[PDB]
Ligand binder design. Structure first.
Ligand SMILES: CS(=O)(=O)NCCc1ccc(F)cc1
Ligand SMILES: [Zn+2]
Ligand SMILES: [Zn+2]
Ligand SMILES: [Zn+2]
Length: 572
């Protein structure tokens, strides 16, 4: 019961019993919280509650210190001091923002704005509170029981009455019953277990709610600038391949942390792996939120770094298949590749945290808590997609509010910027450069003359809330007959149900905009599907069209983004 105030660090015995996490609040801060919010339960060794038998007064504003015990107005002795008076709550060792974080429901974008504009201490209070709120919300959903098993990838489910049914996408990972994690995709539905199992009727699925651990480290350590490269030893013999990044590699060694904004195909993996070749004796931990982001760093490392000094850290509670070429779970190898949630407690000369738009402040803090490093490098792009905020339903979350790193990149600018896109045909580069890069992204490739746009609203149908546009798929089908080279295209849309329909009608491999991030394909066929805030999001639009190396066909619903596409328009 003795700790430090979450706002001003002043030692105290008081914790807010009404807050979901129970933060310690000093006398002068606890008061300003109880007096401005519905939160009135104050806890010390024992709660501030009326000691009189059978009395239910818990509100600290209605309580007094009667000698050594606590009583309300109705039970206090003659000589009794109010627990609440003179700007303080009585405690040992004798905030408008803390109040909003403590009481919000995390459904508004303004909640996330505050969680990123508040003091560092409140960014951790905000991140822990949010995550606990998200986990308790999983309990709201109804249990899914197997009614019948059709095939090895198809079943029919029975849902709990009186409780809502969770969305059926890859975002929502169930737990079978303890037959391993399972996912669903759309009366026939597609089942997919992280463990292969002969689906038994009666077996049920629940979204696994995980215990939210406390946060201790800041999202960003305090910045330090150095006059020389510190604790790192550069090479003179540096491969011409990486010569373009030498000045930025030196910048990395002359600051405690650095931010790198890398638009699509500008050389983020190449930069990250080249940092290892520039400081050859440095121990580097390569981290990211997703297994796909960590695997892409492994792939680039396989090509340039000694395979014997690499290790892929895999949590024994294996969910999806990941990179199999390095020695597994060797925490002490010079190069360690690991997701944030699986990071061991270790030190490093450099920590490289990739795909930073996908990180939350909870992730930023966990990295600073598990890894003690001489230098930290944050790689990503605030113009790409952030992590899904399952509770957020009102308002759009801007890039400067994704996390502390993205906030810094959008306000003071990134420390380093990769300005040349080597992946995309110039039509795509020119469009996204104007759309989200303030005209600073330059094209390496020429215009491919294989980038097309078609304005076709079609017809929007819905599978629950996930959207389908069958006429936009029909327009694609007609295009494919006339453009057989496009047979090899990856179909992309902002909706899984649209992708399910295009998979059966077109036979192309399918990908949501969100799951395509980090990947590249020679040809992309994109159907916007709808003109909603989701399908019109500039970050999602940016990711969707920058997946293409050679050609792209965009069937658009929104006149605005259609007009912005610097593509050859098609007719039908
Ligand atoms: C119990 S909590 O309020 O939910 N989380 C505390 C986060 C924190 C930890 C250390 C600090 F120096 C500042 C804040
Ligand atoms: Zn409270
Ligand atoms: Zn305080
Ligand atoms: Zn009483």
């Amino acid at each position: 019961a003795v700790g430090a105030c979450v706002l001003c660090n002043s030692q105290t015995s008081l914790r807010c019993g009404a807050c979901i996490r129970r933060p310690f609040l000093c006398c002068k801060c606890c008061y300003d919280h109880v007096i401005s919010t519905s939160h009135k339960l104050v806890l010390s060794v024992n709660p501030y509650v009326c000691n009189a038998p059978g009395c239910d007064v818990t509100d600290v504003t209605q309580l007094y210190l009667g000698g050594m015990s606590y009583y309300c107005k109705s039970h206090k002795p003659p000589i009794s001091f109010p627990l609440c008076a003179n700007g303080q709550v009585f405690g040992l060792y004798k905030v408008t923002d803390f109040n909003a974080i403590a009481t919000c429901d995390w459904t508004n974008a303004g909640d996330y704005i505050l969680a990123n504009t508040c003091t560092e201490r409140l960014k951790l209070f905000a991140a822990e509170t949010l995550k606990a709120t998200e986990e308790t919300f999983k309990l709201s959903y109804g249990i899914a029981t197997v009614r019948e098993v059709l095939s090895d990838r198809e079943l029919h489910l029975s849902w709990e009455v009186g409780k809502p049914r969770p969305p059926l996408n890859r975002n929502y990972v169930f737990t079978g019953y303890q037959i391993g994690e399972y996912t669903f995709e759309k009366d026939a539905v597609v089942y997919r277990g992280t463990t292969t199992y002969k689906l038994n009727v009666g077996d049920y699925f629940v979204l696994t709610s995980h215990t939210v651990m406390p946060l201790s480290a800041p999202t960003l350590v305090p910045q330090e600038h150095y006059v020389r490269i510190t604790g790192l030893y550069p090479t003179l013999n540096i491969s011409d391949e990486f010569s373009s990044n030498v000045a930025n590699y030196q910048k990395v060694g002359m600051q405690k942390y650095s931010t790198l904004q890398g638009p699509p195909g500008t050389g983020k993996s190449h930069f990250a792996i080249g940092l290892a070749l520039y400081y050859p004796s440095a121990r580097i931990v390569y981290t990211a939120c997703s297994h796909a982001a960590v695997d892409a760093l492994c792939e680039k490392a396989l090509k340039y770094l000694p395979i014997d000094k690499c290790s892929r850290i895999i949590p024994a509670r294996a969910r999806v298949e990941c990179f199999d070429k390095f020695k597994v779970n060797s925490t002490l190898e010079q190069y360690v590749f690991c997701t944030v949630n699986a990071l061991p407690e270790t030190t490093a000369d450099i920590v490289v945290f990739d795909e930073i738009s996908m990180a939350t402040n909870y992730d930023l803090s966990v990295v600073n808590a598990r890894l003690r490093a001489k230098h930290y490098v944050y790689i990503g792009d605030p113009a790409q997609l952030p992590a899904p905020r399952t509770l957020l339903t009102k308002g759009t979350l801007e890039p400067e509010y994704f996390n502390s790193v993205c906030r810094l990149m959008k306000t003071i600018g990134p420390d380093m910027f990769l300005g040349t896109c080597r992946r995309c045909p110039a039509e795509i580069v020119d469009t996204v450069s104007a759309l989200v890069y303030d005209n600073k992204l330059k094209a390496h490739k020429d215009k491919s003359a294989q980038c097309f746009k078609m304005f076709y609203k079609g017809v929007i149908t819905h599978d629950v809330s996930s959207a389908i546009n069958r006429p936009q798929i029909g327009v694609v089908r007609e295009f494919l007959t006339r453009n057989p080279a496009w047979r090899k295209a990856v179909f992309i849309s902002p909706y899984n149900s649209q992708n399910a329909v295009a998979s059966k009608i077109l036979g192309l491999p399918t990908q949501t905009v969100d799951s395509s991030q980090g990947s590249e394909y020679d040809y992309v066929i994109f159907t916007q599907t709808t003109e909603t805030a989701h399908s019109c999001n500039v970050n999602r639009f940016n990711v969707a069209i920058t997946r293409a190396k050679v050609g792209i066909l965009c069937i658009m619903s929104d006149r605005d983004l259609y007009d912005k596409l610097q593509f050859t328009s098609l007719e039908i």
